[PDB]
Amino acid sequence: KTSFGSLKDEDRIFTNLYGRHDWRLKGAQSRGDWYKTKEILLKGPDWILGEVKTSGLRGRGGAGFPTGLKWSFMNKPSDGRPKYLVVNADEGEPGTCKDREIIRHDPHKLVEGCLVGGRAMGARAAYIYIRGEFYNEASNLQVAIREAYEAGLIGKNACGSGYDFDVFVVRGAGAYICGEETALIESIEGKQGKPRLKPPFPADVGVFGCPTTVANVETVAVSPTICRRGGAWFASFGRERNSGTKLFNISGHVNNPCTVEEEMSVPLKELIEKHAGGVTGGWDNLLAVIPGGSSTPLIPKSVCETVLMDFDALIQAQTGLGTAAVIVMDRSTDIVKAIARLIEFYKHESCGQCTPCREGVDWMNKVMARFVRGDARPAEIDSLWEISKQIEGHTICALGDGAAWPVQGLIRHFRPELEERMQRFAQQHQ
């Protein structure tokens, strides 16, 4: 296959995305969920790991680590400690609002994904760390999990397979850093949401000290559909090492901002002009696109014309795929004000633990607050670049990376706009 996009409704994993069907158990069983789950449990851990490795599923959290290789880190006998799946459901990324839709509209799919994932890794229970601001989504998911316990689908003797598996839901308390997997583990453990250092990886020392796999809602919820439809079905979409379907959140300056499930390697222009109703004012009104939520660098209109929305074609576009959250910015946008609001987000959501992020993200926000007004001189641009290069890869987690990267994208694609901002400040103030 060469061209991608135009995914059919028979090939969607997230049917009832929009809330148009019943989210509860009789609605979920009538759409394909909880079908032959006992056989998927009884065929073993290694079969499910082989199905996920066959499917080419990468980590839907945003980094794209191979999900089969990630879950196979738990494929080892116990040492007295229990083993845990932990489903990351914080989703604090600006641009990204898809896991809210999975929890709110396909909740039993996430429960069956917890069961299949925890069976594959030999886990004892699931901890769905939902964001605390998603309160109605959390109670939605708890009504679904009560339906799953009362139907005998989870808990003692889950799906009649003799396998015991609980599903716990822990609400957050309003910290974006608690979406990072070790900081999420620390937030589950009743501590400050501050990221641990790696090693130890959570497969060795995770939640409570136990072996633990933290995985996103989307990479967990597609796993029963991979185990039913097959690995070759999920590997049939997208390019090689870019396999599957993906939920996209096209927001910003489009006519119809929406969440839509789509084939993996779809072009960005086709996706925006097909599902979002195009950019407000036409495609020539396009200035920039942040392709995968705020952690990825923006790309200008000359890159957005032919770019494919998977991992490797966005690495080649010197950005990242991320959460596949498309933030569209038209020609009327004060783009330095938007990136400075974004760096302001990154200093308000930064847990203060290690030196480069705690100091340099506030120092970058002060530089960006002067760059919006133009109250600077152009030699501070490259200086700002070096400040980002003193945060990138010098931090504990990648929030420092995810704050250095928008600054790098803004400088790299809009240095002339910064310079004319500052020189018109200099002419009308000096």
Partner: protein, 213 residues
Amino acid sequence: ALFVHRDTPKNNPETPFDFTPENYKRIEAIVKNYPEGHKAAAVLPVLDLAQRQNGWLPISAMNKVAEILQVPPMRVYEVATFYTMYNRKPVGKYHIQVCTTTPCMLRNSDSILEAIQKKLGIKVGETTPDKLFTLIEVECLGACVNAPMVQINDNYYEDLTPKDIEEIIDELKAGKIPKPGPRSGRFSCEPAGGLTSLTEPPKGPGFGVQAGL
């Protein structure tokens, strides 16, 4: 806005705080979710419960959470100052939270922020003198395709205009309850000009299931 504590007569360790017996049963249900020897993992839910009974957190809810979970009180103070939901000051009865990050700012969230400000007569960070509305400005609330949006205590109000948010504030003042949804024509997150996908019926159980299963 501070992260130190000073003992006022309305916020001190002699301020009365105690859970209700139904809240003690809820706390026991929370504690039973975690392994034995890791009761400290119930610091974040129970303290949030102490915000749901009281509306905010004096320094008697933090010490009561520290007492009933057998954790040091500084380890509860850290959680109560780290996380942005724990109101360490008494907020109003309707805590309006406007998202002003970049995907909501691109779709003109400042118009709704100024609409709430001139509607209620307060600015960002203040409370109306009848103790009914606290307006603060929050980060990305996870409703980006429904931009712009606000949050009122549990409830997202999405796809908003200044007229819609004036209507919501008018029916919060009227003693009713508003509908937590997008105030535009759409329902949750779909394209507004019709469904661009998921128009076909869902295929039901047994569709495309591979053999040997």
